[PDB]
Short mmCIF file of C-alpha atoms and ligand atoms in Angstrom, two decimals:
data_model
loop_
_atom_site.label_atom_id
_atom_site.label_comp_id
_atom_site.label_asym_id
_atom_site.label_seq_id
_atom_site.Cartn_x
_atom_site.Cartn_y
_atom_site.Cartn_z
CA UNK K 1 15.19 -22.29 -22.66
CA UNK K 2 17.92 -23.17 -25.13
CA UNK K 3 21.00 -21.81 -23.32
CA UNK K 4 23.37 -19.41 -25.09
CA UNK K 5 26.37 -21.02 -26.79
CA UNK K 6 29.33 -20.97 -24.38
CA UNK K 7 32.19 -18.62 -25.18
CA UNK K 8 35.84 -19.61 -25.66
CA UNK K 9 37.97 -20.84 -22.75
CA UNK K 10 39.25 -18.10 -20.45
CA UNK K 11 42.46 -20.15 -20.02
CA UNK K 12 43.33 -22.46 -22.93
CA UNK K 13 46.67 -23.79 -21.62
CA UNK K 14 47.54 -27.47 -21.70
CA UNK K 15 46.58 -29.14 -18.44
CA UNK K 16 45.79 -32.53 -16.99
CA UNK K 17 42.25 -33.48 -18.06
CA UNK K 18 42.31 -37.09 -16.85
CA UNK K 19 42.08 -35.79 -13.29
CA UNK K 20 40.44 -36.67 -9.97
CA UNK K 21 37.16 -34.95 -10.87
CA UNK K 22 36.98 -36.71 -14.28
CA UNK K 23 37.84 -40.41 -13.89
CA UNK K 24 37.11 -42.98 -16.56
CA UNK K 25 34.26 -45.32 -15.67
CA UNK K 26 32.85 -48.26 -17.63
CA UNK K 27 29.35 -48.17 -19.08
CA UNK K 28 26.30 -48.85 -16.93
CA UNK K 29 23.16 -50.37 -18.45
CA UNK K 30 21.46 -47.72 -20.59
CA UNK K 31 24.58 -45.56 -21.09
CA UNK K 32 24.81 -44.41 -24.70
CA UNK K 33 27.97 -44.15 -26.81
CA UNK K 34 28.03 -43.48 -30.53
CA UNK K 35 30.20 -42.83 -33.58
CA UNK K 36 32.28 -39.96 -32.11
CA UNK K 37 35.28 -41.02 -30.01
CA UNK K 38 35.67 -37.43 -28.73
CA UNK K 39 32.18 -37.13 -27.28
CA UNK K 40 32.29 -40.77 -26.13
CA UNK K 41 35.47 -40.10 -24.14
CA UNK K 42 34.03 -36.93 -22.62
CA UNK K 43 30.95 -38.89 -21.45
CA UNK K 44 33.12 -41.74 -20.08
CA UNK K 45 35.17 -39.23 -18.03
CA UNK K 46 32.13 -37.29 -16.80
CA UNK K 47 32.84 -34.11 -18.81
CA UNK K 48 29.41 -34.91 -20.26
CA UNK K 49 26.63 -36.79 -18.49
CA UNK K 50 27.79 -40.41 -18.31
CA UNK K 51 24.57 -41.70 -19.93
CA UNK K 52 25.45 -39.93 -23.22
CA UNK K 53 22.50 -37.51 -23.32
CA UNK K 54 23.44 -33.82 -23.14
CA UNK K 55 22.47 -30.27 -23.96
CA UNK K 56 24.28 -28.33 -26.70
CA UNK K 57 25.84 -26.06 -24.05
CA UNK K 58 27.10 -29.11 -22.12
CA UNK K 59 28.65 -30.50 -25.31
CA UNK K 60 30.38 -27.23 -26.22
CA UNK K 61 31.76 -26.79 -22.69
CA UNK K 62 32.96 -30.40 -22.63
CA UNK K 63 34.81 -30.37 -25.99
CA UNK K 64 36.53 -27.12 -24.99
CA UNK K 65 37.40 -28.08 -21.42
CA UNK K 66 38.39 -31.71 -22.07
CA UNK K 67 40.12 -31.41 -25.45
CA UNK K 68 40.60 -27.69 -26.29
CA UNK K 69 38.29 -27.92 -29.33
CA UNK K 70 37.98 -24.36 -30.65
CA UNK K 71 34.81 -22.37 -29.99
CA UNK K 72 33.73 -21.75 -33.59
CA UNK K 73 34.13 -25.42 -34.52
CA UNK K 74 32.39 -26.51 -31.30
CA UNK K 75 29.42 -24.25 -32.01
CA UNK K 76 29.04 -25.23 -35.66
CA UNK K 77 29.28 -28.99 -35.06
CA UNK K 78 27.11 -29.05 -31.95
CA UNK K 79 24.21 -26.99 -33.32
CA UNK K 80 24.36 -28.82 -36.68
CA UNK K 81 24.10 -32.14 -34.85
CA UNK K 82 21.38 -30.88 -32.51
CA UNK K 83 19.28 -29.45 -35.38
CA UNK K 84 19.18 -32.76 -37.28
CA UNK K 85 19.56 -35.35 -34.46
CA UNK K 86 18.45 -33.68 -31.20
CA UNK K 87 15.22 -32.66 -29.55
CA UNK K 88 14.78 -28.93 -30.04
CA UNK K 89 12.04 -28.56 -27.40
CA UNK K 90 13.81 -30.38 -24.56
CA UNK K 91 17.29 -29.17 -25.69
CA UNK K 92 18.70 -32.72 -25.44
CA UNK K 93 20.85 -34.71 -27.85
CA UNK K 94 21.94 -38.34 -27.69
CA UNK K 95 25.58 -38.92 -28.63
CA UNK K 96 24.57 -42.34 -30.00
CA UNK K 97 21.33 -44.26 -30.48
CA UNK K 98 17.82 -42.88 -30.46
CA UNK K 99 16.48 -42.79 -26.92
CA UNK K 100 13.29 -41.88 -25.08
CA UNK K 101 15.58 -39.89 -22.76
CA UNK K 102 15.57 -36.94 -25.19
CA UNK K 103 11.83 -36.52 -24.47
CA UNK K 104 8.57 -36.40 -26.46
CA UNK K 105 9.30 -36.56 -30.18
CA UNK K 106 8.32 -33.97 -32.78
CA UNK K 107 6.16 -35.07 -35.70
CA UNK K 108 7.48 -36.95 -38.72
CA UNK K 109 9.51 -36.45 -40.83
CA UNK K 110 11.89 -35.37 -38.01
CA UNK K 111 13.65 -38.43 -36.55
CA UNK K 112 15.51 -37.19 -33.40
CA UNK K 113 17.68 -40.26 -33.89
CA UNK K 114 20.82 -39.20 -32.02
CA UNK K 115 24.28 -39.09 -33.57
CA UNK K 116 23.73 -42.68 -34.81
CA UNK K 117 21.15 -41.44 -37.34
CA UNK K 118 22.60 -42.17 -40.76
CA UNK K 119 22.76 -39.43 -43.38
CA UNK K 120 22.04 -36.41 -41.18
CA UNK K 121 25.44 -35.85 -39.53
CA UNK K 122 26.88 -39.40 -39.49
CA UNK K 123 27.99 -40.80 -42.84
CA UNK K 124 30.06 -43.21 -44.85
CA UNK K 125 33.81 -43.93 -45.03
CA UNK K 126 34.44 -43.41 -41.31
CA UNK K 127 37.87 -44.60 -40.14
CA UNK K 128 36.96 -47.00 -37.31
CA UNK K 129 33.17 -47.43 -37.81
CA UNK K 130 31.54 -49.28 -40.70
CA UNK K 131 29.12 -47.74 -43.20
CA UNK K 132 25.45 -48.00 -42.21
CA UNK K 133 24.77 -50.28 -45.21
CA UNK K 134 26.92 -52.97 -43.52
CA UNK K 135 24.76 -53.01 -40.36
CA UNK K 136 26.47 -50.86 -37.71
CA UNK K 137 27.60 -47.25 -38.13
CA UNK K 138 28.49 -46.61 -34.47
CA UNK K 139 30.39 -49.39 -32.70
CA UNK K 140 34.17 -49.57 -32.74
CA UNK K 141 35.32 -51.99 -35.45
CA UNK K 142 38.52 -53.93 -34.76
CA UNK K 143 39.25 -54.78 -38.41
CA UNK K 144 38.99 -51.10 -39.38
CA UNK K 145 41.13 -50.07 -36.42
CA UNK K 146 43.78 -52.65 -37.42
CA UNK K 147 43.80 -51.04 -40.87
CA UNK K 148 44.36 -47.66 -39.20
CA UNK K 149 47.31 -49.27 -37.36
CA UNK K 150 48.64 -50.68 -40.65
CA UNK K 151 48.37 -47.26 -42.35
CA UNK K 152 50.12 -45.70 -39.34
CA UNK K 153 52.93 -48.28 -39.67
CA UNK K 154 53.24 -47.66 -43.43
CA UNK K 155 52.92 -43.85 -43.55
CA UNK K 156 53.53 -42.56 -40.01
CA UNK K 157 56.44 -44.60 -38.65
CA UNK K 158 53.97 -46.39 -36.37
CA UNK K 159 52.08 -43.21 -35.40
CA UNK K 160 48.94 -41.62 -36.77
CA UNK K 161 49.69 -38.24 -38.32
CA UNK K 162 48.33 -36.06 -41.16
CA UNK K 163 50.19 -38.10 -43.81
CA UNK K 164 48.50 -41.25 -42.50
CA UNK K 165 45.16 -39.40 -42.46
CA UNK K 166 45.61 -38.49 -46.15
CA UNK K 167 46.19 -42.10 -47.16
CA UNK K 168 43.56 -43.69 -44.91
CA UNK K 169 40.84 -41.17 -45.85
CA UNK K 170 41.33 -42.14 -49.50
CA UNK K 171 41.46 -45.89 -48.76
CA UNK K 172 38.14 -45.75 -46.88
CA UNK K 173 36.48 -43.84 -49.73
CA UNK K 174 37.78 -46.37 -52.27
CA UNK K 175 36.62 -49.32 -50.14
CA UNK K 176 33.13 -47.83 -49.79
CA UNK K 177 32.99 -47.22 -53.57
CA UNK K 178 33.94 -50.86 -54.17
CA UNK K 179 31.51 -52.44 -51.67
CA UNK K 180 28.68 -50.08 -50.61
CA UNK K 181 26.16 -49.62 -53.46
CA UNK K 182 24.53 -46.80 -51.47
CA UNK K 183 27.79 -44.95 -50.69
CA UNK K 184 27.13 -41.21 -50.35
CA UNK K 185 29.89 -38.60 -50.16
CA UNK K 186 28.33 -35.18 -50.73
CA UNK K 187 27.67 -31.89 -48.95
CA UNK K 188 27.96 -32.04 -45.14
CA UNK K 189 29.55 -35.51 -45.05
CA UNK K 190 32.07 -34.59 -47.75
CA UNK K 191 33.32 -31.82 -45.43
CA UNK K 192 33.22 -33.68 -42.09
CA UNK K 193 34.88 -36.81 -43.50
CA UNK K 194 38.04 -34.77 -44.14
CA UNK K 195 38.00 -32.74 -40.94
CA UNK K 196 37.48 -35.76 -38.66
CA UNK K 197 40.71 -37.40 -39.91
CA UNK K 198 42.75 -34.49 -38.48
CA UNK K 199 41.20 -34.73 -35.01
CA UNK K 200 43.26 -37.66 -33.69
CA UNK K 201 46.48 -35.83 -34.66
CA UNK K 202 45.31 -32.45 -33.30
CA UNK K 203 43.34 -33.44 -30.20
CA UNK K 204 44.26 -36.99 -29.03
CA UNK K 205 47.99 -36.15 -28.87
CA UNK K 206 49.09 -35.20 -25.34
CA UNK K 207 49.28 -31.39 -25.18
CA UNK K 208 52.77 -31.32 -23.66
CA UNK K 209 54.00 -32.75 -26.97
CA UNK K 210 51.43 -31.44 -29.50
CA UNK K 211 53.59 -32.94 -32.25
CA UNK K 212 50.79 -34.40 -34.38
CA UNK K 213 52.04 -37.98 -33.87
CA UNK K 214 49.43 -40.15 -32.15
CA UNK K 215 50.68 -43.49 -30.74
CA UNK K 216 48.56 -46.61 -31.22
CA UNK K 217 48.05 -47.29 -27.49
CA UNK K 218 46.48 -43.85 -27.05
CA UNK K 219 44.57 -44.29 -30.32
CA UNK K 220 43.01 -47.56 -29.18
CA UNK K 221 42.23 -46.09 -25.76
CA UNK K 222 40.18 -43.27 -27.32
CA UNK K 223 38.69 -45.06 -30.34
CA UNK K 224 37.70 -48.32 -28.61
CA UNK K 225 37.39 -47.61 -24.88
CA UNK K 226 36.47 -43.91 -24.80
CA UNK K 227 39.34 -43.54 -22.33
CA UNK K 228 42.02 -40.90 -21.94
CA UNK K 229 45.51 -42.23 -21.33
CA UNK K 230 46.71 -42.07 -17.74
CA UNK K 231 47.99 -38.50 -17.09
CA UNK K 232 46.55 -37.17 -20.37
CA UNK K 233 47.05 -33.43 -20.93
CA UNK K 234 44.75 -31.71 -23.41
CA UNK K 235 46.11 -29.72 -26.35
CA UNK K 236 47.93 -26.45 -25.50
CA UNK K 237 45.66 -24.13 -27.54
CA UNK K 238 42.21 -24.20 -29.16
CA UNK K 239 42.03 -26.11 -32.44
CA UNK K 240 39.95 -28.49 -34.52
CA UNK K 241 40.73 -29.21 -38.16
CA UNK K 242 44.09 -27.59 -38.78
CA UNK K 243 46.05 -29.57 -41.39
CA UNK K 244 42.94 -30.73 -43.28
CA UNK K 245 44.58 -29.26 -46.41
CA UNK K 246 47.28 -31.99 -46.15
CA UNK K 247 44.60 -34.69 -46.10
CA UNK K 248 42.81 -33.25 -49.15
CA UNK K 249 46.02 -32.61 -51.10
CA UNK K 250 47.08 -36.26 -50.74
CA UNK K 251 44.13 -37.46 -52.89
CA UNK K 252 41.82 -34.67 -54.05
CA UNK K 253 38.26 -35.93 -54.57
CA UNK K 254 35.03 -34.57 -55.99
CA UNK K 255 31.76 -35.04 -54.06
CA UNK K 256 29.52 -37.81 -55.36
CA UNK K 257 27.81 -41.10 -54.69
CA UNK K 258 27.43 -44.64 -55.90
CA UNK K 259 24.16 -44.90 -57.83
CA UNK K 260 22.62 -48.11 -56.48
CA UNK K 261 25.55 -50.33 -57.45
CA UNK K 262 29.16 -50.81 -56.44
CA UNK K 263 31.85 -49.08 -58.54
CA UNK K 264 29.43 -46.47 -59.91
CA UNK K 265 30.75 -43.32 -58.21
CA UNK K 266 29.05 -40.40 -59.92
CA UNK K 267 30.01 -36.80 -59.25
CA UNK K 268 27.23 -34.53 -57.99
CA UNK K 269 27.55 -30.99 -59.45
CA UNK K 270 24.81 -29.73 -57.10
CA UNK K 271 26.93 -30.64 -54.04
CA UNK K 272 29.04 -28.11 -52.23
CA UNK K 273 32.79 -28.76 -52.15
CA UNK K 274 35.79 -26.98 -50.60
CA UNK K 275 35.48 -24.16 -53.18
CA UNK K 276 31.94 -23.37 -51.89
CA UNK K 277 31.88 -23.49 -48.07
CA UNK K 278 28.90 -21.09 -47.80
CA UNK K 279 26.85 -23.38 -50.06
CA UNK K 280 27.45 -26.24 -47.59
CA UNK K 281 25.89 -24.13 -44.82
CA UNK K 282 23.01 -22.95 -47.04
CA UNK K 283 22.07 -26.45 -48.19
CA UNK K 284 22.36 -27.82 -44.67
CA UNK K 285 19.74 -25.31 -43.48
CA UNK K 286 17.52 -25.00 -46.59
CA UNK K 287 17.45 -28.69 -47.46
CA UNK K 288 18.59 -30.91 -44.58
CA UNK K 289 17.03 -29.06 -41.60
CA UNK K 290 13.99 -27.81 -43.54
CA UNK K 291 13.14 -31.32 -44.81
CA UNK K 292 13.03 -32.62 -41.20
CA UNK K 293 10.80 -29.72 -40.13
CA UNK K 294 8.86 -28.58 -43.24
CA UNK K 295 5.94 -26.83 -41.45
CA UNK K 296 6.69 -26.63 -37.73
CA UNK K 297 4.19 -25.58 -35.09
CA UNK K 298 4.80 -22.44 -33.02
CA UNK K 299 7.10 -23.75 -30.25
CA UNK K 300 9.19 -25.80 -32.73
CA UNK K 301 9.55 -22.90 -35.14
CA UNK K 302 10.86 -20.75 -32.29
CA UNK K 303 13.33 -23.45 -31.17
CA UNK K 304 14.48 -23.98 -34.77
CA UNK K 305 15.14 -20.26 -35.31
CA UNK K 306 17.10 -19.94 -32.04
CA UNK K 307 19.28 -22.98 -32.80
CA UNK K 308 19.73 -21.76 -36.39
CA UNK K 309 20.99 -18.40 -35.05
CA UNK K 310 23.41 -20.31 -32.81
CA UNK K 311 24.54 -22.45 -35.76
CA UNK K 312 25.29 -19.27 -37.70
CA UNK K 313 27.66 -18.08 -34.93
CA UNK K 314 29.90 -21.02 -35.89
CA UNK K 315 29.74 -20.30 -39.64
CA UNK K 316 32.95 -18.91 -41.12
CA UNK K 317 33.17 -15.15 -41.71
CA UNK K 318 31.86 -14.01 -45.10
CA UNK K 319 28.78 -16.22 -45.39
CA UNK K 320 25.30 -14.72 -45.35
CA UNK K 321 22.72 -16.12 -42.92
CA UNK K 322 19.68 -17.86 -44.44
CA UNK K 323 16.22 -17.91 -42.87
CA UNK K 324 14.07 -20.95 -43.77
CA UNK K 325 11.24 -19.97 -41.37
CA UNK K 326 11.47 -16.20 -41.80
CA UNK K 327 13.09 -13.62 -39.56
C1 HEM W 1 31.88 -30.57 -31.00
C2 HEM W 1 30.95 -31.51 -31.13
C3 HEM W 1 31.16 -32.81 -31.81
C4 HEM W 1 30.17 -33.52 -32.43
C5 HEM W 1 28.70 -33.16 -32.40
C6 HEM W 1 30.76 -34.66 -33.03
C7 HEM W 1 30.05 -35.64 -33.76
C8 HEM W 1 30.65 -36.61 -34.53
C9 HEM W 1 29.96 -37.52 -35.38
C10 HEM W 1 28.47 -37.62 -35.56
C11 HEM W 1 30.91 -38.29 -35.98
C12 HEM W 1 30.65 -39.41 -36.96
C13 HEM W 1 30.94 -38.94 -38.36
C14 HEM W 1 31.22 -40.12 -39.22
O1 HEM W 1 32.34 -40.69 -39.15
O2 HEM W 1 30.33 -40.54 -39.98
C15 HEM W 1 32.17 -37.88 -35.51
C16 HEM W 1 33.39 -38.42 -35.89
C17 HEM W 1 34.56 -38.17 -35.19
N1 HEM W 1 34.72 -37.34 -34.12
FE1 HEM W 1 33.45 -36.06 -33.48
N2 HEM W 1 32.07 -34.65 -32.77
C18 HEM W 1 32.41 -33.55 -32.10
C19 HEM W 1 33.66 -33.19 -31.61
C20 HEM W 1 34.80 -33.97 -31.64
C21 HEM W 1 35.95 -33.78 -30.87
C22 HEM W 1 36.17 -32.65 -29.89
C23 HEM W 1 36.83 -34.81 -31.19
C24 HEM W 1 38.15 -35.11 -30.60
C25 HEM W 1 38.53 -34.66 -29.40
C26 HEM W 1 36.16 -35.64 -32.14
C27 HEM W 1 36.68 -36.75 -32.76
C28 HEM W 1 36.02 -37.44 -33.78
C29 HEM W 1 36.70 -38.47 -34.58
C30 HEM W 1 38.12 -38.96 -34.48
C31 HEM W 1 35.78 -38.93 -35.45
C32 HEM W 1 36.01 -39.98 -36.51
C33 HEM W 1 35.73 -41.37 -35.98
C34 HEM W 1 36.00 -42.38 -37.07
O3 HEM W 1 35.97 -42.07 -38.29
O4 HEM W 1 36.28 -43.55 -36.78
N3 HEM W 1 34.92 -35.13 -32.34
N4 HEM W 1 31.98 -36.88 -34.57
C1 NAG W 2 46.09 -21.20 -16.86
O1 NAG W 2 46.12 -22.58 -16.52
C2 NAG W 2 47.46 -23.09 -16.48
C3 NAG W 2 47.40 -24.61 -16.37
O2 NAG W 2 46.55 -25.03 -15.31
C4 NAG W 2 48.24 -22.37 -15.37
O3 NAG W 2 49.60 -22.81 -15.34
C5 NAG W 2 48.20 -20.87 -15.65
O4 NAG W 2 48.92 -20.11 -14.66
C6 NAG W 2 46.75 -20.43 -15.72
N1 NAG W 2 46.61 -19.01 -15.96
C7 NAG W 2 46.03 -18.17 -15.09
C8 NAG W 2 45.98 -16.74 -15.52
O5 NAG W 2 45.57 -18.52 -14.02
C1 NAG W 3 21.18 -44.96 -48.53
O1 NAG W 3 21.42 -43.65 -49.06
C2 NAG W 3 20.37 -42.70 -48.82
C3 NAG W 3 20.83 -41.33 -49.32
O2 NAG W 3 21.18 -41.41 -50.70
C4 NAG W 3 20.00 -42.63 -47.33
O3 NAG W 3 18.80 -41.85 -47.17
C5 NAG W 3 19.79 -44.01 -46.73
O4 NAG W 3 19.58 -43.91 -45.32
C6 NAG W 3 21.03 -44.86 -47.00
N1 NAG W 3 20.95 -46.09 -46.20
C7 NAG W 3 22.03 -46.80 -45.83
C8 NAG W 3 21.85 -48.03 -44.95
O5 NAG W 3 23.15 -46.51 -46.21
C1 NAG W 4 34.10 -54.61 -39.18
O1 NAG W 4 34.59 -54.19 -40.44
C2 NAG W 4 34.90 -55.28 -41.30
C3 NAG W 4 35.65 -54.75 -42.52
O2 NAG W 4 34.85 -53.83 -43.27
C4 NAG W 4 33.59 -56.00 -41.62
O3 NAG W 4 33.84 -57.08 -42.53
C5 NAG W 4 32.99 -56.53 -40.32
O4 NAG W 4 31.73 -57.17 -40.58
C6 NAG W 4 32.78 -55.35 -39.37
N1 NAG W 4 32.13 -55.77 -38.13
C7 NAG W 4 32.68 -56.51 -37.17
C8 NAG W 4 31.76 -56.79 -36.02
O5 NAG W 4 33.82 -56.94 -37.20
C1 NAG W 5 54.14 -38.83 -40.52
O1 NAG W 5 55.20 -39.67 -40.06
C2 NAG W 5 56.15 -40.01 -41.07
C3 NAG W 5 57.21 -40.90 -40.45
O2 NAG W 5 57.74 -40.30 -39.27
C4 NAG W 5 56.78 -38.75 -41.68
O3 NAG W 5 57.58 -39.09 -42.81
C5 NAG W 5 55.74 -37.74 -42.12
O4 NAG W 5 56.41 -36.51 -42.46
C6 NAG W 5 54.77 -37.51 -40.98
N1 NAG W 5 53.77 -36.52 -41.38
C7 NAG W 5 53.40 -35.49 -40.60
C8 NAG W 5 52.38 -34.58 -41.19
O5 NAG W 5 53.85 -35.28 -39.49
C1 NAG W 6 18.37 -20.84 -49.15
O1 NAG W 6 17.12 -20.16 -49.01
C2 NAG W 6 17.24 -18.74 -49.08
C3 NAG W 6 15.85 -18.14 -48.86
O2 NAG W 6 15.51 -18.23 -47.48
C4 NAG W 6 17.83 -18.32 -50.42
O3 NAG W 6 18.11 -16.92 -50.42
C5 NAG W 6 19.13 -19.06 -50.70
O4 NAG W 6 19.59 -18.77 -52.03
C6 NAG W 6 18.93 -20.56 -50.54
N1 NAG W 6 20.18 -21.26 -50.80
C7 NAG W 6 20.24 -22.48 -51.33
C8 NAG W 6 21.61 -23.04 -51.54
O5 NAG W 6 19.25 -23.14 -51.62
C1 3DM W 7 34.92 -28.86 -37.39
O1 3DM W 7 34.45 -29.99 -38.13
C2 3DM W 7 33.91 -31.11 -37.56
C3 3DM W 7 33.26 -31.09 -36.32
C4 3DM W 7 32.72 -32.24 -35.76
C5 3DM W 7 32.79 -33.47 -36.41
C6 3DM W 7 33.43 -33.59 -37.65
O2 3DM W 7 33.55 -34.77 -38.32
C7 3DM W 7 32.74 -35.88 -38.02
C8 3DM W 7 34.02 -32.39 -38.28
O3 3DM W 7 34.65 -32.48 -39.48
CL1 CL W 8 38.27 -21.10 -29.16
MG1 MG W 9 30.14 -43.00 -40.23
#
């Protein structure tokens, strides 16, 4: 019932992806878009179902076909998101808000809240979306985008590149520390917050150039309108987070959180960090997934174990698989 994770592209060359079969269309009533401009764009070009509800296999195929996201990264992200935000029985995940379209819900404490669910996959210090504490963690924010433009002007000669990513990533962390008393920057979010800042440079840059310099017209088109530029070619090879080391090196940070007040950022020594990637995977499964499904019934336990096996396919070589519900 859960389909097998798709394999890598047979042909990963750059090609036109804004093509006749995948035109941009505006939203219809009920169409769901969320905090990810990549998935949003794929839905708005029909690489995913246009209503924003999809299976993990549909998501993996879409990120590969439309943007040349690499297979390992696609698998890890998709199954992580599905485990914490999707319906494991129906095999459906919303790319934004919680919806009845993902089917009959499992029992509490599982939320099946879609990608909009705060603190599962989605988290604080996003580039163009506000922190959940401020009321909306999913819609495009013009003020935040204008700051991205400003940082691109200051550090990228008017373009978004890895140097800009390094500076903006830090600025957003510092702004959340100063204003969000509930700011959390540990474990899974600590990792994804860095990786996501490379994606516009690696994946939104036309693949015929692949120069890591994203122009602001293209940036707005993706971030605000979920729309590929006219004649957009995808990247010329599979990739996801390459160059994340540049972003980290610009302003190395420890994982931590504000402790109920602004300007109280307190390092968490129980968090994983970039020195312990396997711990990030182990805590995600043992703590995050397990807490949503502490004592699942038979069909849920089976679906959990299958999706956990799929998640492990995307885990970097050298980590040991963990089994929260037995073998
Ligand atoms: C493979 C499955 C994917 C999933 C499940 C996924 C999910 C998400 C989620 C939940 C966020 C919000 C994190 C946060 O800021 O709090 C996010 C951010 C982001 N995603 Fe993805 N994503 C995926 C692939 C991609 C791809 C292929 C691209 C580009 C082609 C992309 C581009 C981005 C960008 C740029 C952000 C940051 C948005 C911002 O901070 O303003 N994603 N994604
Ligand atoms: C792979 O796709 C590219 C772009 O569409 C094309 O030029 C190339 O010849 C394809 N390779 C094969 C083996 O068909
Ligand atoms: C506040 O932080 C906790 C995690 O420490 C999280 O469970 C909760 O959803 C957060 N809420 C908002 C609006 O940030
Ligand atoms: C956008 O972000 C700014 C800056 O953090 C915030 O003040 C504003 O309330 C957000 N929302 C909108 C709708 O502009
Ligand atoms: C970003 O652009 C600026 C200005 O062109 C340049 O100095 C810097 O080296 C660029 N960084 C990257 C990683 O391309
Ligand atoms: C996760 O649970 C497994 C037992 O299934 C255990 O071996 C492992 O040490 C745990 N890891 C963490 C980080 O809790
Ligand atoms: C490969 O890593 C990732 C995959 C999907 C989303 C991410 O950031 C939100 C991310 O950092
Ligand atoms: Cl790949
Ligand atoms: Mg966020």
